């Protein structure tokens, strides 16, 4: 019931990141959505309305249960998925204890009191918490910490999937643009859930993960990658998800490891969520003794792709392509990204 609203948020957040140009894209729409839905619990009317409206939400406000049900569906299970939300506030700054309880009971997030007066020490404590949560998967999440930081929200997610089809693999070229870099390329000839799309002008490949998730890979045609990203809708993907077919093909899928770091203040500010970041913010649910604003909001997403009588077509993902991970249970967009260069 919430996935059509969250899937539209995934595209509007992804398409906003294409403009902001030739870089690797990878983020978790559900993690960014749950982080700010969690943050909405400590906001007032005008400030609370922007967050939910900015997430494509008349809203029932049972979305927290739908987010909790999704988070509980993703709770540790059947796939190695590392996700967490860290709230870092400045010491002193009388906090509201009713907020810190719901942040851990509903969304399993943790709140910490740090000293932003020491910008180098505060950055170390935040990175070490994420490094502890990701266990070395994400190192040095925070690069720059502003001097006037009073409240920071960090959202991290790391994904290592288990292929239902175990997929040996060799090296190959990768054509970044009409440029040529090299990379390791996995290969497998057999029956795949693959077809072409006249509307999207792209190859559509579906491979399911052993953790009840399914990855959808979009290989655009010669020079129509921009047309693919503009034509992607939630209804088109549901049709591909409902598609049950099997065809023979020689698949070339690259083994990659891509990372995505984004400042959520800028990208969500262009999506209508600006009250929590402005000087007129109303975070009374977090602190009722002084005005408070969300200084920094950063999202980090890291992906690891690995192996877990007729001439067929060679479907080579040797050029930029768009991919999408869908949780088969809820049909939510778990991940969305675009691989321009696996070397970065």
């Amino acid at each position, epitope marked *: 019931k919430i996935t059509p609203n969250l899937a539209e948020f995934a595209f509007s957040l992804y398409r906003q990141l294409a403009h902001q140009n030739s870089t690797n894209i990878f983020f978790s729409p559900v993690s960014i959505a749950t982080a700010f839905a969690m943050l909405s619990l400590g906001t007032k009317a005008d400030t609370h309305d922007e967050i939910l409206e900015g997430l494509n939400f008349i809203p029932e406000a049972q979305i927290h249960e739908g987010f909790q049900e999704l988070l509980r569906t993703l709770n540790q299970s059947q796939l190695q998925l590392t996700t967490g939300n860290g709230l870092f506030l400045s010491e002193g700054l009388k906090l509201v204890d009713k907020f810190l309880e719901d942040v851990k009971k509903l969304y399993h997030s943790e709140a910490f009191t740090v000293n932003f007066g020491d910008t180098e020490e505060a950055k170390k404590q935040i990175n070490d918490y994420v490094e502890k949560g990701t266990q070395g998967k994400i190192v040095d999440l925070v690069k720059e910490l502003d001097r006037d930081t009073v409240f920071a929200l960090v959202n991290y997610i790391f994904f290592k999937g288990k292929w239902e089809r175990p997929f040996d693999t060799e090296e190959e070229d990768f054509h970044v643009d009409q440029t040529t870099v090299k990379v390791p390329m996995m290969k497998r000839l057999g029956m795949f859930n693959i077809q*072409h799309c006249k509307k999207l002008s792209s190859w559509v490949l579906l491979m399911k993960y052993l953790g009840n998730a399914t990855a959808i890979f979009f290989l655009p045609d010669e020079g129509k990658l921009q047309h693919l990203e503009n034509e992607l809708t939630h209804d088109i993907i549901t049709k591909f998800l409902e598609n049950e077919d099997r065809r023979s093909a*020689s698949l070339h899928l690259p083994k990659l490891s891509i990372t995505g770091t984004y400042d959520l203040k800028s990208v969500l500010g262009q999506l209508g969520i600006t009250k929590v970041f402005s000087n007129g913010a109303d975070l009374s649910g977090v602190t009722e003794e002084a005005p408070l604003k969300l200084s920094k909001a950063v999202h980090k997403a890291v992906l690891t792709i690995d192996e877990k009588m007729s*001439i067929p077509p060679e479907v080579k993902f040797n050029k930029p392509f768009v991919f999408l991970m869908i949780e088969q249970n809820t049909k939510s967009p778990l991940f969305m990204g675009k691989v321009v260069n696996p070397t970065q």
Partner: antibody
Amino acid sequence: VQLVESGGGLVKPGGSLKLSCAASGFTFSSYTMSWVRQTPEKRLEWVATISSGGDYTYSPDSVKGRFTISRDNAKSTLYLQMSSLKSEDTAMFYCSRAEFITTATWGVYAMDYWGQGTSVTVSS
Amino acid sequence: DIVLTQSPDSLAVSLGQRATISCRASESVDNYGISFMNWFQQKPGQPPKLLIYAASNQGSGVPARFSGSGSGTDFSLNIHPMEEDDTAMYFCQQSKEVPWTFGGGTKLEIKR
């Protein structure tokens, strides 16, 4: 896009001959290549087909033992090594590029670009 | 092997008239809703040129006067206003199953 054949000539029955196909104007290592011969009766007969990387080769049973197709993507050249040649194999050998053209949820392999061809004569 | 039989062997068409070449396959060359039949044009001394792919789609730079049709095991190639440049050999070729096979060929000449 240009394809230039070479290596054809006169050979005795049972002899050997290696043909080359110089490619240019495109990424040769990204396209499927094929060999097609045309008998003196102007009849086209498919000879061999190799994938983009060279991992898969295809050929009919009439030439499965005598003809082998290979490619050197580093030199952008297609090769066809002929052995145990017979007089009936005398034909005009063309090399062409097989491009998979998408039409409706799938596509077909179509040899869209061809070379001028090289003449092979097998006689005593 | 899917054997391709063309009809007729030769055809004389006046300028501006209709040219129809048929191609019959021993087995079905359709798969996944699309047909694997291709048409090629070859003039003497020149290599063959891709004319029609997927049995009904015009190739790169092929004018609208070349038209392909058919489905299953029976296909046809249609050249409306017959021009002076169309005197050549025409072959149908299937790519549904290995080995790839060509038709016997059809010699199309201008009737004057």
